[PDB]
């Protein structure tokens, strides 16, 4: 626990139970382009291209693609401000960030509603995410629903 490159890693760089071994082919078949969104997860079975332990699990953006490295931009919290960092990692340490898929589907579907309303004279009725407000009203039936009486009950010791 002195100040080194790999300090205090006992449960962060341990491979989980019944999952040892070299990774598979579905990692290597993926591609990355400039402007995507990528999270970082260390696979502790290769020793060429590991980043520092601080960046384990933070999402960034991809700006360059090299023959052996990918470039990711991030944000670190140095004493006062929020700065800008760049790192080069290998392909076996990344993962495609989901979470824009429900957003990018909403872009493609709203773009279709705008197109069909050009042929008509109506105003646009876009798709936006729902809101939750006060509790709405409902209707209960007392034909098949019977109330159950609830009351207190005397205390009984466990033995």
């Amino acid at each position: 626990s002195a100040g080194g490159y790999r300090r205090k890693t006992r449960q962060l760089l341990k491979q989980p139970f019944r999952k040892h071994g070299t990774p598979g082919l579905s990692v290597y078949l993926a591609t990355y382009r400039i402007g995507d969104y990528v999270t970082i997860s260390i696979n502790p079975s290769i020793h060429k291209g590991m980043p520092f332990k601080y960046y384990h699990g933070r999402t960034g953006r991809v700006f360059t693609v090299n023959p052996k490295s990918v470039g990711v931009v991030l944000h670190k919290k140095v004493n006062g401000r929020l700065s800008v960092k760049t790192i080069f990692v290998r392909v076996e340490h990344l993962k495609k960030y989901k979470g824009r898929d429900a957003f990018l589907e909403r872009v493609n579907k709203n773009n279709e509603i705008l197109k069909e309303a050009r042929e008509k004279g109506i105003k646009l009725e876009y798709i936006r995410q729902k809101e939750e407000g006060p509790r709405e009203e409902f209707i209960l039936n007392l034909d098949e629903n019977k109330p159950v009486k609830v009351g207190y009950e005397p205390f009984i010791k466990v033995y």
């Binding site: 953006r61 360059t64 004493n79 006062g80 760049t86």
Partner: protein
């Protein structure tokens, strides 16, 4: 010394948020240091024949 106090971390968080916390803006992409040199030379040649 008098074996004084070594050092604490109290009100480090209070001194930070006095003037807020500024977020340094990443500029336009393909301008940060470290772009592939082979990729940049072809980008330069493609712009000259354009204009």
């Amino acid at each position: 010394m008098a074996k004084k106090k070594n050092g604490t971390l109290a009100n480090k968080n209070y001194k930070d948020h006095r003037n807020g916390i500024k977020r340094q803006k990443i500029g336009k992409l393909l301008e940060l240091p470290g772009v592939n040199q082979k990729f940049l030379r072809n980008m330069k040649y493609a712009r000259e024949g354009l204009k």
